[PDB]
Design a protein around this nucleic acid. Structure first.
Ligand SMILES: [Mg+2]
Ligand SMILES: [Mg+2]
Ligand SMILES: [Mg+2]
Ligand SMILES: [Zn+2]
Lengths: 220, 86, 26, 99, 135, 99
RNA sequence: ACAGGUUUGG
């Protein structure tokens, strides 16, 4: 039991323990239309510090802070996937719902791209089952629903003390999101880039966990 | 907790009060850190930090809330409305 | 230090305002 | 390393300037019985009606020519705090990659 | 059980002070990762108040010196003959070639705008492209 | 079963108008309704990847149907690109009587 | 004032 704490305490002492810096860069985010946001009138008030400027009406999201936030988001999701944490990909957007279900299936994590029920996270012991384990991380691929209002889980996770990583556009509200990533969530390649980044992050985390357990079996 | 029966409302409030728990920073576990003067919807609360000898000279409900928190020394003055929920 | 930073200048693509049928007439 | 402002100053969307009456090559990525979802590439996808001539030549993956009118359709109305975005772009169909 | 208050503080503070008080006997597995790699901004709740009065946004417009020549190009010739290909990252349009000729004709010691404009308009014919002046 | 119900009707001849009130002895799988299988292991992690959607069977059926629709779409696009028509109309099932 | 009772189907 004393050596079990070593497996959980090892990755906490390193910054890039899973080597996620090679996954992306500012040029890898630029060609995916990530730096593009909505118009100037659709700008949320809490998006001003995360913006680079306005290119003839359309707001431009800076990519330096985008990558600086994405590094922390990928590190956190890789660490929670390493510590055997339940990860739920939530997104209410009727264009990439199938892509998100397939990404969560290839990741071995869980997905919610359908109509989020009322008491799902709060009234879980009555909505899901008698005793249910709530997800240890919620990754939001679209913060707003089809009504252009903040999602229900973005508030229910903050109510249930569940960490939330979220891709926020120029019209989103990151006040309650634990790890916001200022980028674009409306272009197909921009969505696919984030889905593949989180895919490779969970894959590398589970693989390094299996390797650490392989050496755990040889340490005794 | 609201229900048709009084014991049912009591239980609905007991089992629902634990889900909303605050943590009150208590200076030396007997008082508050500084004198706070707050203005709620229509209630004015003025609470002052007191030494070890001024034990709970507050409203009859604020004394109970501070006795549940752990504050052993406090002076509070409620002006304006005296609504219990506010 | 950066040279490619945008400069606070006026809008060059400012389309001229539309005129009425009797703009600058008598 | 390359800075984001340096790549954005030389990005083609910066070179285009205003999106009014601009010739853009866009690729179709979805097909509806009468509507064609063309991806001109900027932010959103424009939905155009299949013309009468050479209508069978428009398939998924076909690149066509468009005259961009608006990058994103947003407008304000009575008592609205923000705009009502349509999540679409406005452009007309002219041809299919003449070459 | 826990703290279901969203507007009081952040999830990290609400999970830390609960264990500090001794009501949460089990530490969540994400708390060590939050203590190790905290985000840039603490996820505290902030109400989106509206902006009244003379107060405006803090963002600035994106404009370069090349736009002043791109406006002349789009005012005189309009859209270039080569249609825009937004998929190509290194795509160079006719207006970009025009401003590339303009920035060097500026370095060649010329100040007059006509002597910087019509000479680049004639230099574009050296490569073999066509220009349609919109009357 | 045709001898089980026949022997029950003789040994316990209950005269009642409602057929469901009579004594009946069948296999437990027709008497008891379809019970839901376990959804999570001993560690708490759910089995299906759509468990947090409320309807992990219906949404999985819809996801498989959409995944096969996209496969048919891409295969038919490639077949139209190669100019081959080997499929037929297999939807008209009127003489069979399908619903 | 450490306050409490009292307007009303609420
Ligand atoms: Mg968006
Ligand atoms: Mg009174
Ligand atoms: Mg009255
Ligand atoms: Zn006039």
């Amino acid at each position: 039991n004393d050596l079990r704490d070593r497996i959980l305490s090892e990755p906490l002492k390193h910054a890039d323990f899973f080597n996620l810096k090679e996954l992306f860069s500012v040029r890898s985010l630029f060609d995916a239309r990530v730096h593009l946001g909505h118009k100037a009138g659709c700008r949320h008030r809490f998006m001003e510090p995360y913006l680079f400027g306005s290119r003839l009406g359309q707001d431009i999201i800076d990519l330096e802070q985008t990558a600086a936030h994405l590094q922390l988001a990928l590190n956190f999701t890789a660490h929670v996937a390493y510590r055997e944490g339940i990860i739920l990909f939530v997104s209410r957007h009727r264009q990439f719902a199938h892509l998100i279900e397939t990404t969560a299936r290839d990741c071995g994590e869980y997905a919610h791209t359908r109509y989020f029920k009322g008491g799902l996270l709060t009234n879980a012991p009555l909505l899901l089952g008698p005793g249910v384990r709530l997800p240890d991380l919620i990754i939001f691929l679209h913060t707003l629903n089809n009504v252009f209002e903040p999602h229900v889980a973005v508030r229910d996770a903050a109510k249930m003390n569940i960490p939330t990583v979220g891709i926020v556009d120029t019209n989103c509200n990151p006040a309650l999101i634990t790890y916001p990533v200022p980028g674009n969530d409306d272009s197909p390649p921009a969505v696919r880039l984030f889905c593949r980044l989180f895919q490779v992050a969970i894959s590398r985390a589970k693989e390094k966990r299996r390797q650490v357990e392989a050496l755990y079996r040889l340490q005794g | 907790g609201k229900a048709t029966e009084r014991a049912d409302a009591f239980r609905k409030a007991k089992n629902r009060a634990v889900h909303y728990l605050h943590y009150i920073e208590r200076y030396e576990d007997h008082t508050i850190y500084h004198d706070i003067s707050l203005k709620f919807k229509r209630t004015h609360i003025k609470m002052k930090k007191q030494p070890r000898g001024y034990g709970l000279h507050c409203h009859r409900a604020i004394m109970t809330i501070c006795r549940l928190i752990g504050i052993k020394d406090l002076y509070a003055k409620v002006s304006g409305s005296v609504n219990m929920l506010n | 230090s950066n040279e490619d930073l945008p400069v606070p200048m006026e809008n060059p693509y400012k389309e001229p305002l539309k005129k009425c049928i009797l703009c600058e007439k008598h | 390393v390359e800075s984001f402002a340096s790549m954005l100053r030389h990005s083609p969307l910066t070179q285009m300037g205003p999106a009014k009456n601009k010739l853009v090559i866009g690729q179709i990525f979805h097909i509806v019985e009468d509507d064609l979802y063309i991806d001109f590439g900027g932010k959103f996808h424009c939905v155009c009606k299949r013309p009468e001539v050479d209508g069978e030549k428009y398939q998924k993956g076909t690149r066509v020519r468009l005259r961009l009118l608006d990058l994103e359709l947003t407008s304000r109305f009575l008592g609205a705090t923000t705009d009502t975005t349509i999540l679409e772009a406005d452009a007309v169909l002219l041809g299919l990659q003449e070459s | 059980a826990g703290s279901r208050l969203e507007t009081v503080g952040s999830i990290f503070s609400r999970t830390r002070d609960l264990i500090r008080a001794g009501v949460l006997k089990e530490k969540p597995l994400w708390l060590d990762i939050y203590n190790a790699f905290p985000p840039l901004r603490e996820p505290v709740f902030r109400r989106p108040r509206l902006r009244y009065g003379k107060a405006k946004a803090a963002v600035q417009d994106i404009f370069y010196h090349e736009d002043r020549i791109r406006a002349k190009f789009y005012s005189a010739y309009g859209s270039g003959p080569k249609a825009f290909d937004l998929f190509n990252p290194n795509f160079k349009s006719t207006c970009q070639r025009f401003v590339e000729k303009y920035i060097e004709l500026q370095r060649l010691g010329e100040t007059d705008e006509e002597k910087l404009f019509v000479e680049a308009g004639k230099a574009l014919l050296a490569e073999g492209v066509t220009l349609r002046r919109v009357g | 079963q045709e001898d089980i119900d026949r022997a029950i009707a003789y040994l316990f001849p209950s005269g009642l108008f409602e057929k469901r009130a009579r004594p009946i002895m069948k296999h437990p799988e027709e008497i008891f309704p379809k019970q839901r299988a376990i959804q999570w292991g001993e560690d708490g992690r759910p089995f299906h990847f759509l468990f947090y959607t409320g309807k992990q069977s219906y949404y999985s059926l819809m996801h498989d149907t959409y995944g096969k629709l996209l496969d048919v779409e891409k295969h038919h696009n490639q077949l139209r690109a190669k100019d081959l028509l080997a499929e037929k109309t297999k939807i008209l099932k009127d003489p069979i009587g399908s619903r």
